[PDB]
Amino acid sequence: KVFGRCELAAAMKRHGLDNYRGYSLGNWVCAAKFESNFNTQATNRNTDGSTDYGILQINSRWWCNDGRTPGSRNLCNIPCSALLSSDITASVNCAKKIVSDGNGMNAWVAWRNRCKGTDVQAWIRGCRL
Ligand SMILES: [Cl-]
Ligand SMILES: [Cl-]
Ligand SMILES: [Cl-]
């Protein structure tokens, strides 16, 4: 599913991401924009043999199991395919664990490079939230 911007904002808010670990909703929308372009089916291979999955490009070395990644820990206890669903519940639950792991949203390199420090509230402009 390719979410609309405000559609994703509303889903993220409903699932409790607005201000989760102190990160406003616009931070999460911005991250998803640059991680996946709002496409739940996005996948991207990394050099270490892991793959990133879903709306927030969650990695198969630490977080989800894809059956082919060296050193896999499956800390979210979920198949990586669950992170491609049209329903973002599994991605949100896992993202909550990731953002709590110590480095906050810097865990998402694209957030650090493209969202951190910017006017992230722009990402929720116009939405009825
Ligand atoms: Cl915001
Ligand atoms: Cl959803
Ligand atoms: Cl933090």
Side-chain angles (χ1 to χ4, degrees):
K1 170 171 173 79
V2 179
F3 273 82
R5 181 175 57 85
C6 293
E7 187 188 16
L8 182 61
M12 287 182 154
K13 178 172 182 170
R14 174 167 55 87
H15 285 294
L17 279 183
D18 184 13
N19 226 23
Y20 191 87
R21 283 277 162 155
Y23 289 91
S24 65
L25 189 54
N27 280 286
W28 293 106
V29 176
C30 185
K33 171 66 180 179
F34 294 123
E35 289 289 353
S36 68
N37 206 13
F38 304 148
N39 187 349
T40 67
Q41 299 191 256
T43 63
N44 289 284
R45 184 81 88 144
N46 295 27
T47 64
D48 67 0
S50 69
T51 301
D52 295 330
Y53 295 84
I55 190 79
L56 288 166
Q57 290 292 278
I58 292 174
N59 191 260
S60 63
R61 182 164 175 154
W62 298 108
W63 304 112
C64 62
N65 170 248
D66 70 6
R68 67 172 192 192
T69 301
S72 179
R73 298 276 303 273
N74 196 9
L75 294 171
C76 292
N77 291 289
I78 197 89
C80 296
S81 62
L83 306 180
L84 309 178
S85 48
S86 58
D87 179 338
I88 67 172
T89 300
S91 282
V92 170
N93 281 334
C94 188
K96 288 177 174 174
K97 297 190 174 75
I98 295 167
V99 76
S100 301
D101 187 68
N103 293 332
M105 287 193 77
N106 297 291
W108 288 273
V109 173
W111 176 84
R112 179 170 56 76
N113 289 331
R114 308 181 72 174
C115 300
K116 183 180 188 178
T118 75
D119 181 18
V120 294
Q121 188 276 333
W123 290 99
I124 61 166
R125 296 245 173 86
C127 309
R128 310 189 170 262
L129 292 165

